[PDB]
A paper describes a structure:
Sarcosine oxidase from Bacillus sp. (SoxB) recognizes the cyclic imino acids l‐proline (l‐Pro), d‐proline (d‐Pro), and l‐thioproline (l‐Tpr) as minor substrates.
The Tyr254Ala and Tyr254Gly mutants exhibited enhanced reactivity toward cyclic imino acids by eliminating this spatial interference. Crystallographic analysis of the mutants revealed an enlarged active site, which facilitated reactions with five‐membered cyclic imino acids. These mutations disrupted the electron delocalization associated with l‐Tpr, thereby eliminating charge transfer and substrate inhibition.
Author numbering: 2 to 382
The structure:
């Protein structure tokens, strides 16, 4: 059967696209190597931060705000839990974090609601945080935490109810693009459509070559740990925030304990360079997995440094400039690419689903996606 649209990779981006297409009666096939949500890609480990005031760049702010509204819409549409409004705390040494400074500029440029705090004020407001007096902070009360696996699961169920088809456990191996149609090849059969969306996560770094693209995309092994914590300090129930922070040796992101699961932490600016088909997905096989996390906790969040309850191993896919790629294929207007989310895309996946649907159906989008151009110089070595 010939589809209107085929999505290859039904993960964060692809499943959101599938939902957007299905809701409009577009006949859509999604193909995934596994059965999303799953633990082999970039979307597991339960939780993801969404921030609006954006330390990676003030220009992501409208897409973040649109995505936030889309997440509230999803919360209303499903029985799965989507979002909890933890707020997000950003801190770092005063005058020595570009990330903090840009987050502050973004909030002023877009009139976001934030609180500015420094030093002992941070430690006083949130028992359990111990920063030096020379640190400053910006706290965003209305952003928070997404349950990422639930997001994908909900978009899947909703899309499928509207007639989208999802072909699981099926790896796309090659492509054949014509001026007026697209074709995918798999071990389970070949499929055709009018339009293609390519959203294969870390595997974009191996298979975009089949579409005659040569773009630096490096996959990285990124672990997270959940730690037994003082629940009187670090529980969501006592308003402990989500956080993304810069310290002299890099950026860390974390989450309050939800229902006693433990504070969750990840070291964002370091990971191992890997291949997605040979990555070691067992937490704790390198001593850095646990040690890098406790190095942060014992300094800054000392009551959240108990027994390791749970670990996970996830992948980032970085571009050279760490900005996304969201665009048409330069040689094929019937092919849409979503790649290179550089460890910070999940929060936008709802909005990206909308962009991808518009690009597929119309070749354009109402969103400003200029900074994510596939033709930009900074993508290339
Ligand atoms: C790993 C990670 C990422 C992350 C994060 C912490 C960790 C440890 N923290 C984040 C945060 O707090 N907030 C945020 O906004 N983002 C954060 N991230 C990044 C984010 O999770 C990623 O940027 C995002 O998930 C990327 O999504 P994308 O849709 O690109 O990737 P995916 O969900 O893995 O989906 C890809 C799918 O493609 C399928 N696949 C692969 N190969 C094939 C083939 N050949 N054929 C068909 N399907 C294929 C995969 O199976 C997967 O489902
Ligand atoms: Cl990523």
């Amino acid at each position: 059967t010939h589809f209107d649209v085929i999505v290859v990779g039904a993960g964060s981006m692809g499943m959101a696209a599938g939902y957007q297409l299905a809701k409009q009666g577009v006949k859509t096939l999604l193909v995934d190597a596994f059965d999303p949500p799953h633990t082999n890609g970039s979307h597991h480990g339960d939780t993801r931060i969404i921030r609006h005031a954006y330390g990676e760049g003030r220009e992501y702010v409208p897409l973040a705000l649109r995505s936030q509204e889309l997440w509230y819409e999803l919360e209303k549409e499903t029985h799965h839990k989507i979002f909890t409004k933890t707020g997000v705390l950003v801190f770092g040494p005063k005058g020595e974090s570009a990330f903090v400074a840009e987050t502050m500029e973004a909030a002023k440029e877009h009139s976001l609601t934030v609180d500015l705090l420094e030093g002992d004020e941070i430690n006083k407001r949130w028992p359990g945080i111990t920063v030096p007096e020379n640190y400053n902070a910006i706290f965003e009360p209305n952003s928070g935490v997404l349950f990422s696996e639930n997001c994908i699961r909900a978009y899947r169920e909703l899309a499928e109810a509207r007639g989208a088809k999802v072909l699981t456990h099926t790896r796309v191996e090659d492509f054949d693009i014509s001026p007026d149609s697209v074709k995918i090849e798999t071990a389970n059969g070949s499929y055709t459509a009018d339009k293609l969306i390519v959203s294969m996560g870390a595997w974009n770094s191996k298979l975009l070559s089949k579409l005659n693209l040569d773009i630096p995309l490096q996959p990285y092994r990124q672990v997270v740990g959940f730690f037994e914590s003082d629940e009187s300090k670090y529980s969501n129930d006592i308003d402990f925030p989500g956080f993304m922070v810069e310290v002299p040796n890099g950026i860390y992101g974390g989450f309050p304990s939800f229902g006693g699961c433990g504070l969750k932490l990840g070291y964002h600016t370091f990971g191992q360079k890997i291949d997605p088909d040979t990555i070691n997905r067992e937490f704790g096989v390198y001593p850095e997995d646990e040690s890098n996390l406790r190095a942060f906790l014992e300094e800054y969040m000392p009551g959240a440094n108990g027994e390791l309850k749970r670990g996970a191993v996830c992948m980032y896919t970085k571009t050279l400039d760490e900005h996304f790629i969201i665009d048409l294929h330069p040689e094929h207007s019937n092919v849409v690419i979503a790649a290179g989310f550089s460890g910070h895309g999940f929060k936008f996946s709802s909005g990206v689903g909308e962009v991808l649907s518009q690009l597929a159906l119309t070749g354009k989008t109402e969103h400003d996606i200029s900074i994510f151009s596939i033709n930009r110089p900074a993508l290339k070595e």
